[PDB]
């Protein structure tokens, strides 16, 4: 498989962040979703989960196709919840309906953590949509009960090494764990609607203990009313990924400039760009428009 970006005809940046500033003014106005919190965490989760499927010896899977709205991968068990993150985005690709599906998915999780006050993330647009049959099998999402050679190998077939695993695991600061969607329960840490280094200093400053929860899966807990999945404690049992969290703890602009780098790539996995194709766009935030 070649899956070669497409811009949507006639469509410059201009269109594109109306779109952006459609999905920001409903994040602004729904801000009760999930005790507060909001439907940004459910969004980045969502640009992640359409991604994270792609496979790098084959070329099948990840955010071109906009498979996810077809039944399988929509009611893939490791996507319960996003179901919330559709429901959110729907108004919007049916005021724009000219946007494809996985160019709309993937703009929801840059407007998201731009908005939730994190770092400038590049897009592109060009992903088309693509048949039903094009869409992945369940079980390439990964498990949460499992250690750091499991999160190594795994992020291994999305070609992602260490520095950008953990720097995109730097989003488990947001939103929290459900107990019907995963069978864990929890936030990670206090700020979780603003991007910050905060699940990097949580690893590092709590004091953690291991425990079963009311469904029978073990995570780590803290005092403080936080949680760590195993996979997320694994990081600060691994040598390598440990002095990265430590970095990231002490210096919140290099995770940022990095979790940019790696969360575009994790979006764009899969795709190629004809250099006709244009630039990337750094949409403005509301704020910076004044709206
Ligand atoms: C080995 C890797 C990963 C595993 C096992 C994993 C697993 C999970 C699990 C079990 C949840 C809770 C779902 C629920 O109950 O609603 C969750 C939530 C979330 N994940 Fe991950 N995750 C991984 C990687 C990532 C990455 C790379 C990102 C983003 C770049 C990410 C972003 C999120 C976000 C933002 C949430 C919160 C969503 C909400 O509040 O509804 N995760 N993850």
Same mark, same amino acid.
């Given at each position: 498989?070649?899956?070669?970006?497409?811009?949507?005809?006639?469509?410059?940046?201009?269109?594109?962040?109306?779109?952006?500033?459609?999905?920001?003014?409903?994040?602004?106005?729904?801000?009760?979703?999930?005790?507060?919190?909001?439907?940004?965490?459910?969004?980045?989760?969502?640009?992640?989960?359409?991604?994270?499927?792609?496979?790098?010896?084959?070329?099948?899977?990840?955010?071109?196709?906009?498979?996810?709205?077809?039944?399988?991968?929509?009611?893939?068990?490791?996507?319960?919840?996003?179901?919330?993150?559709?429901?959110?985005?729907?108004?919007?690709?049916?005021?724009?309906?000219?946007?494809?599906?996985?160019?709309?998915?993937?703009?929801?999780?840059?407007?998201?953590?731009?908005?939730?006050?994190?770092?400038?993330?590049?897009?592109?647009?060009?992903?088309?949509?693509?048949?039903?049959?094009?869409?992945?099998? !369940?079980?390439?999402?990964?498990?949460?009960?499992?250690? /750091?050679?499991? &999160?190594? #190998?795994?992020?291994?077939? @999305? %070609?992602?090494?260490?520095?950008?695993?953990?720097?995109?695991?730097?989003?488990?600061?947001?939103?929290?764990?459900?107990?019907? !969607?995963?069978?864990?329960?929890?936030?990670?840490?206090? /700020?979780?609607? &603003?991007? #910050?280094?905060?699940?990097? @200093? %949580?690893?590092?400053?709590?004091?953690?203990?291991?425990?079963?929860?009311?469904?029978?899966?073990?995570?780590?807990?803290?005092?403080?009313?936080?949680?760590?999945?195993?996979?997320?404690?694994?990081?600060?049992?691994?040598?390598?990924?440990?002095?990265?969290?430590?970095?990231?703890?002490?210096?919140?602009?290099?995770?940022?400039?990095?979790?940019?780098?790696?969360?575009?790539?994790?979006?764009?996995?899969?795709?190629?760009?004809?250099?006709?194709?244009?630039?990337?766009?750094?949409?403005?935030?509301?704020?910076?428009?004044?709206?």
């Amino acid at each position: 498989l070649v899956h070669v970006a497409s811009v949507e005809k006639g469509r410059s940046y201009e269109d594109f962040q109306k779109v952006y500033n459609a999905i920001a003014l409903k994040l602004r106005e729904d801000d009760e979703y999930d005790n507060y919190i909001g439907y940004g965490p459910v969004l980045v989760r969502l640009a992640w989960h359409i991604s994270g499927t792609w496979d790098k010896h084959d070329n099948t899977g990840g955010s071109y196709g906009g498979t996810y709205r077809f039944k399988k991968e929509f009611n893939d068990p490791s996507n319960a919840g996003l179901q919330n993150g559709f429901k959110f985005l729907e108004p919007i690709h049916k005021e724009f309906p000219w946007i494809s599906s996985g160019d709309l998915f993937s703009l929801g999780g840059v407007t998201a953590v731009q908005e939730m006050q994190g770092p400038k993330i590049p897009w592109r647009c060009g992903r088309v949509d693509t048949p039903e049959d094009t869409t992945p099998d !369940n079980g390439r999402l990964p498990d949460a009960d499992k250690d /750091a050679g499991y &999160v190594r #190998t795994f992020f291994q077939r @999305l %070609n992602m090494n260490d520095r950008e695993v953990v720097a995109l695991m730097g989003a488990h600061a947001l939103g929290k764990t459900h107990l019907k !969607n995963s069978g864990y329960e929890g936030p990670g840490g206090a /700020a979780n609607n &603003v991007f #910050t280094n905060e699940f990097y @200093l %949580n690893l590092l400053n709590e004091d953690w203990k291991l425990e079963k929860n009311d469904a029978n899966n073990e995570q780590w807990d803290s005092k403080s009313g936080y949680m760590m999945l195993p996979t997320d404690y694994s990081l600060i049992q691994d040598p390598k990924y440990l002095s990265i969290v430590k970095e990231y703890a002490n210096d919140q602009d290099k995770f940022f400039k990095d979790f940019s780098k790696a969360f575009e790539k994790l979006l764009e996995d899969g795709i190629t760009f004809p250099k006709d194709a244009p630039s990337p766009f750094i949409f403005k935030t509301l704020e910076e428009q004044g709206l």
